[PDB]
Amino acid sequence: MDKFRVQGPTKLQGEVTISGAKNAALPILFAALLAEEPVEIQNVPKLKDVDTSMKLLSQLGAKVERXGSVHIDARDVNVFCAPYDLVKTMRASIWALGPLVARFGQGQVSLPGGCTIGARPVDLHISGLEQLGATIKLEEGYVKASVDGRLKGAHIVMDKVSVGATVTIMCAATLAEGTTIIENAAREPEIVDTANFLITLGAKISGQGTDRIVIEGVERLGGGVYRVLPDRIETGTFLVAAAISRGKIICRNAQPDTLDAVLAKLRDAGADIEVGEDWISLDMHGKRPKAVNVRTAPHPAFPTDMQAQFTLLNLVAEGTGFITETVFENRFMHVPELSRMGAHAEIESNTVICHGVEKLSGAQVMATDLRASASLVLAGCIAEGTTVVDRIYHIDRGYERIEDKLRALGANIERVKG
Numbered sequence: 001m002d003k004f005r006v007q008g009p010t011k012l013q014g015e016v017t018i019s020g021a022k023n024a025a026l027p028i029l030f031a032a033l034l035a036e037e038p039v040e041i042q043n044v045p046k047l048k049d050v051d052t053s054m055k056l057l058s059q060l061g062a063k064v065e066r067x068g069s070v071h072i073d074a075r076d077v078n079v080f081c082a083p084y085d086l087v088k089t090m091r092a093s094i095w096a097l098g099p100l101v102a103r104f105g106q107g108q109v110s111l112p113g114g115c116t117i118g119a120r121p122v123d124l125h126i127s128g129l130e131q132l133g134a135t136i137k138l139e140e141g142y143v144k145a146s147v148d149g150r151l152k153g154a155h156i157v158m159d160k161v162s163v164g165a166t167v168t169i170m171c172a173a174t175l176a177e178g179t180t181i182i183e184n185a186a187r188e189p190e191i192v193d194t195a196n197f198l199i200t201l202g203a204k205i206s207g208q209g210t211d212r213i214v215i216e217g218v219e220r221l222g223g224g225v226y227r228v229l230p231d232r233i234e235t236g237t238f239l240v241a242a243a244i245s246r247g248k249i250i251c252r253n254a255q256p257d258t259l260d261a262v263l264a265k266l267r268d269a270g271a272d273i274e275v276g277e278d279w280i281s282l283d284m285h286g287k288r289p290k291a292v293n294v295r296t297a298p299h300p301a302f303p304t305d306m307q308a309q310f311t312l313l314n315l316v317a318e319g320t321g322f323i324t325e326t327v328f329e330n331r332f333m334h335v336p337e338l339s340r341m342g343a344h345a346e347i348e349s350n351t352v353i354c355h356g357v358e359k360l361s362g363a364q365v366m367a368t369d370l371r372a373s374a375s376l377v378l379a380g381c382i383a384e385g386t387t388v389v390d391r392i393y394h395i396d397r398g399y400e401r402i403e404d405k406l407r408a409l410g411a412n413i414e415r416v417k418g
């Protein structure tokens with residue numbers, strides 16, 4: 001059980017290079033199952049989630065290897081099943097379903113069970129597939145999909161906004177007969193990145209980034225080389241690290257147009273922000289941040305992946321501020337942990353009410369969320385004394401060497417094998 005020993009208070013300042021988007025690398029690796037030629041994905045972050053992706057790819061019969069790039073050879077895919085052991089350690093595995101059925105006419109993926117942040121049904125995934133002409137059945141816990149011949153382009157209108165389902169249907173449609181039109185699709189930057197990867201392979205897609213996506217099926221997909229976009233959540237996390245420590249930072253290898261909502265909130269907190277074509281600068285001017293009000297929602301609104309980070313900001317800010325969660329109703333585990341550190345907060349339903357304090361106190365806290373838990377590490381950096389963050393394996397799933405980056409910012413952080 002690895003742990004993070006953190007020494008505070010520490011002023012976070014200097015520079016950081018942003019890694020490739022974890023949430024773009026993932027769908028792309030799964031979309032590779034469609035490719036008939038070798039493919040090279042560049043700028044992929046070194047993190048646990050990518051490893052599990054590779055492991056799955058490999059079991060399916062693909063030839064995989066990695067460094068900064070990931071090499072995938074999906075010519076010999078001979079097995080069509082994402083087993084219980086894998087899906088349980090990473091619900092995103094569900095992504096194997098679509099490519100599998102669109103290409104081999106068959107696909108068996110384990111039905112994801114309960115997750116600690118809230119209700120996570122995949123009804124939209126299954127539903128979208130059926131509309132494409134697939135027959136789906138549930139046996140032994142496996143959602144079994146099949147289709148005689150090829151999928152059928154269709155007009156699909158989405159009940160609710162879903163990053164996962166939009167990618168499942170989008171991918172499966174690239175190999176169907178005719179035109180598919182997804183209505184009420186998710187606009188996430190990562191979906192644009194996945195569509196772009198698809199086009200590079202010979203797929204015909206338009207509308208990515210808007211509520212309407214149009215796919216024109218083709219008989220086959222080739223190979224190619226593709227560079228994954230910068231990680232917006234990583235970028236936001238570092239910007240916040242500087243904002244709560246009264247420091248200044250420059251983010252290198254970034255994509256500003258991807259953070260409208262987050263940047264706006266930072267300004268409201270009183271930060272001095274500048275942007276270039278591939279950089280973002282943040283200066284607090286020695287100032288303590290001002291409380292802000294946030295409301296999570298699908299892109300381009302404020303993202304739930306930045307939620308715990310902003311809760312932290314409010315917790316050490318001047319005044320009272322609220323954060324409402326409309327995507328993951330119960331994504332609040334971090335709050336009680338921050339409470340062990342001296343934070344003042346109350347949770348009313350799906351809203352956390354924050355009362356900012358001058359300073360936090362080191363304590364023993366526990367990570368549980370691959371993204372939200374980074375807030376515990378950030379708290380450790382500015383808290384008074386020593387903080388021990390337990391179970392960082394969660395954080396290893398979502399961040400590429402977060403200790404190294406923090407250390408280069410002035411943080412007193414250590415990884416122990418106790």
Ligand SMILES: CC(=O)N[C@H]1[C@@H](OP(=O)(O)OP(=O)(O)OC[C@H]2O[C@@H](n3ccc(=O)[nH]c3=O)[C@H](O)[C@@H]2O)O[C@H](CO)[C@@H](O)[C@@H]1O[C@H](C)C(=O)O
Pocket residue numbers: 023026092119120121122123124125160161162163164165186303304305327328370371398
């Ligand atoms: C791997 C990956 O990219 N995961 C991300 C993706 O999850 P996803 O699961 O696809 O998100 P959704 O489908 O947009 O989530 C939609 C909302 O809608 C409900 N819903 C979803 C599907 C469905 O069929 N039926 C249905 O009802 C669902 O319950 C949820 O409340 O989108 C989330 C929101 O941005 C991210 O927080 C999440 O990050 C994670 C943490 C990470 O970094 O690993």
